[PDB]
């Protein structure tokens, strides 16, 4: 039973919760069956549950699915809840454009988390600041919301339900994309968002236009990485290895250094 094992709190459809077995903080996410796009098996479950199980492990860069329940009209997902947290969207809203040292640490942690997803056969398809939680005391970032994800494949994708302003121009123009290169595009949008204080593009014409204007002082090295991730042609984009070998990405802070310097 679901109501007995957890104390359900108010809204955060995600609710705050505590696991009665040990007073562990949890997030209780409810997903209505009628709105579920893709299904998979593990036992028929939402694709989101499949992907969350495949990435669940000791690696602290992705949100951990602790348990799940099926109800007549919905599935209930018990997710870990770090405290204290703030999502990266609210963090950037309040603080504005982040120092490049902080953006480097955050972006590096997102890269490691996305690599973890891909290593586990999972494509997130909705990388954005809203879907990233910041453990304010440990300086560790967590990728959340796999509700738009899919199994990682090397063939073309012709469906997409993530966030359009983070979607790549080949999706806008031709409604097709490949997983890793579309992911790198969204990471370019995220990095610009970090160092400039907001995303670069709002309209489709901007997404496909191929021009990146910097509204903030950003180093030549960081500008180059962003423009490389935002190459119009997917094959012109860097691999994850090329991103992490890029000159701007060197000498990253440790997560605890990041918290002590920038979060405490």
């Amino acid at each position: 039973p679901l109501e007995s094992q957890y104390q359900v709190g108010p809204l955060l459809s995600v609710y705050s919760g505590i696991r009665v077995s040990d007073n562990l903080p949890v997030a209780i996410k409810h997903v209505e069956k009628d709105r579920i796009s893709d299904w998979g098996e593990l036992t028929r479950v939402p694709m989101e549950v499949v992907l969350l199980k495949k990435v669940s492990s000791g690696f602290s860069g992705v949100i951990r699915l602790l348990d799940w329940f099926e109800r007549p009209d919905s599935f209930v997902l018990i997710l870990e809840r770090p405290e204290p947290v703030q999502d990266l969207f609210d963090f950037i809203t309040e603080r504005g454009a982040l120092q490049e040292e902080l953006a480097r640490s955050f972006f590096w942690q997102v890269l490691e988390a996305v690599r973890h997803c891909h290593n586990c056969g999972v494509l997130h398809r909705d990388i954005k600041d809203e879907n990233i939680l910041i453990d304010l005391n440990r300086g560790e970032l967590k990728l959340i919301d796999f509700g738009s994800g899919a199994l990682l494949k090397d063939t073309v994708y012709t469906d997409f339900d993530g966030t359009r302003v983070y979607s790549p121009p080949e999706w806008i123009r031709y409604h097709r994309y490949h997983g890793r290169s579309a992911a790198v595009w969204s990471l370019g949008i995220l990095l610009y968002d970090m160092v400039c204080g907001d995303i670069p593009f709002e309209h489709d014409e901007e997404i496909i236009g191929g021009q990146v204007f910097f509204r903030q002082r950003v180093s030549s090295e960081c500008q180059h990485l962003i423009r490389w991730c935002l190459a119009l042609r997917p094959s012109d984009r860097p691999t994850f290895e090329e991103i992490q070998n890029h000159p701007w990405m060197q000498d990253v802070l440790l997560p605890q250094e990041t918290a002590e310097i920038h979060l405490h």
Partner: peptide
């Protein structure tokens, strides 16, 4: 400049 969230779904 209006910074805003963008629903996915």
């Amino acid at each position: 400049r209006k910074r805003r969230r963008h629903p996915s779904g």
